[PDB]
Structure 1
Amino acid sequence: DLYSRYKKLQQELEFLEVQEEYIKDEQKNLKK
């Protein structure tokens, strides 16, 4: 298949986006 090769690969862009925001939160939370 080729049709899943783009949708399931932007799926991990949505999955990828949250994590830098997460370590962004823990970056201050481990300080305070």
Structure 2
Amino acid sequence: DLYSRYKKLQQELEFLEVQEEYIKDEQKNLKK
């Protein structure tokens, strides 16, 4: 199951960036 362990880790790593990109847009616009 080590292949599934690697790709799910690679999945969440590149998916945590879209959360960290979308929040910085939302926190910037919520000031305005």
TM-score (ref. length: structure 2)? 0.75
Deviations 1:1-32 (A, max 9, x none): 11111111110011111111111001111011
Gapped regions of structure 1 (runs ≥ 5): none
Q: TM-score, normalising length from structure 1?
A: 0.75
Query: Is the helix fraction higher in 1 or 2?
Result: 2
- Over aligned residue pairs, what C-alpha RMSD do you find? 0.9
Runs of at least 4 residues off by over 4 Å: none
Q: Which runs of 5+ in 2 are unaligned?
A: none
Instruction: Tell me, in whole angstroms, the C-alpha distance in 2 between the residues paired with 1:2 and 1:21.
Output: 29
Task: Give 1:4's aligned residue.
Answer: 4
